[PDB]
């Protein structure tokens, strides 16, 4: 009081020395339930995959991806991600996700790497120099191979010229090694394009069926449709706490409200154009916010 009044003597007076403000602690973040998971499991565990000549193409949209499930397990033989770190992939929210699945032999898993020379890499399936994606592969000898050899999976071995990135061309007409044409009858200098994989259990690790899922992540002008999951660990009440509800933030005490609210609304406004009530996104209960305790000492 002596410092505020700048006098060593004070007598029978009431004085406002300073202002006290309660500081919030235990900042919590609340987001809705992680519902509508993307079906990454479908492409990875598909009963039958497709041969690389016509690799299966998948589009993932309007869902949340738990990339963690793919990268938490150590089962996959090869987990290679180019440009995008698997850690914090959930945070990296992308507008379009493309999943490409094909069965190749082990010697060539390496070929899928961007800018690699190869008979599977250039003639059949080619990733771009700018590939923001991940390459996942596992050995599945007991799943694809059958006794008597496997002719189920096929790959073009001869093509007139290389194919551009992300281009699959199903051509079964007889190939043209030289100048004269045999018109679709297989013969000398005239070979059918498709070549049998011939998968077998007794074969070397290199010549075994390796199903390969290739993820791609794409950013365009269009708004993001494939975001990652968010943490909604705990909700605290009856105390001054800093909250974050759907981008809207604020420091205040969270209490229950007894008045009725509409189902489609999610925010609340006071008469003073200030936030009065905040509806929980994943909980039906309403959280009535109040300003933190502040006054003059």
């Amino acid at each position: 009081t002596k410092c505020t009044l700048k006098s060593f003597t004070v007598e029978k007076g009431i004085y406002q020395t300073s202002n006290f403000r309660v500081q919030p602690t235990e900042s919590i973040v609340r987001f809705p339930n992680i519902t509508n998971l993307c079906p990454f499991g479908e492409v990875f565990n598909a009963t039958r995959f497709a041969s690389v000549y016509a690799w299966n193409r998948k589009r993932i949209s309007n869902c949340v991806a738990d990339y963690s499930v793919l990268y938490n397990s150590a089962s996959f033989s090869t987990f290679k991600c180019y440009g995008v770190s698997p850690t914090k992939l959930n945070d990296l929210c992308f507008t379009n996700v493309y999943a490409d699945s094909f069965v190749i032999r082990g010697d060539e898993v390496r070929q899928i790497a961007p800018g690699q020379t190869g008979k599977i890499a250039d003639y059949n399936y080619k990733l771009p120099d700018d590939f923001t994606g991940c390459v996942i592969a596992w050995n599945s000898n007991n799943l694809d191979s059958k006794v008597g050899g496997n002719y189920n999976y096929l790959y073009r071995l001869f093509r007139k010229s290389n194919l551009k990135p992300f281009e699959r061309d199903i051509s079964t007409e007889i190939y043209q090694a030289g100048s004269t044409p045999c018109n679709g009858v297989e013969g000398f200098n005239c070979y059918f394009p498709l070549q049998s994989y011939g998968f077998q259990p007794t074969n070397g690790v290199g010549y075994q069926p390796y199903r390969v899922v290739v993820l791609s992540f794409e950013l365009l002008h269009a708004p993001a449709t494939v975001c990652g999951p968010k943490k909604s660990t705990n909700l605290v009440k009856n105390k001054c706490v800093n909250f974050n509800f759907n981008g809207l933030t604020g420091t205040g005490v969270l209490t229950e409200s007894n008045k009725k609210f509409l189902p489609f609304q999610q925010f609340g406004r006071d008469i003073a154009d200030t936030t009065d009530a905040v509806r929980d996104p994943q909980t039906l209960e309403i959280l009535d916010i109040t300003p933190c305790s502040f006054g003059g000492v």
Partner: antibody
Amino acid sequence: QVQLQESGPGLVKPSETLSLTCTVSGGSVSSSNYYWSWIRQPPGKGLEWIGYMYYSGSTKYNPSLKSRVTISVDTSKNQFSLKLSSVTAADTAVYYCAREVYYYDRSGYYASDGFDIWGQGTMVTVSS
Amino acid sequence: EIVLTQSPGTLSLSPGERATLSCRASQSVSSSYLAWYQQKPGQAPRLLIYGASSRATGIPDRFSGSGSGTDFTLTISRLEPEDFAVYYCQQYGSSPQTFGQGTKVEI
């Protein structure tokens, strides 16, 4: 298929900066994933790394030669270059362009298999 | 910088004879990022073997990487006249990246 073609002076007089350009073929230099590099081999001695280029033209150099070495890129020209200042006779060697590809992993090491494709090389000698 | 020692520096083995190059890093590399490079005389080096054990793109299965951590070993089988060249080991796990002196196999 991503061949690298070295282009440099055959003989350089001393006290002259050494300029060597890799004429890349078929790869946009600014690909993020590729991290091209420079390697030299003094005769009768092991290969020595000079420096690589981080994506977007940013560059990192071997700390030993960092003071006298700068790496430049010319994406407009589809080639990248190495400039070494104050070269001596000992510094000169057969210089080799090289490519590296960096892939992230669950483990988290951005670093990855490297020196997949080498240029033909060019024997450079520095003497009076 | 980490120093890689190649033992023995020189070898004289008949074709069809098994060879082993002991590349022992001074500091252990857990990632097994040591990669073997074959340089043919008067020619640019090629990637012979990577990730401790690999077959490159066309490298013969005959060559096979081995070892982990402090020491690494390269094994050749059914040696061919085309496999007489200097071999190198490189660590990209830590930077600066260094190469070994090189081992030359002769007839």
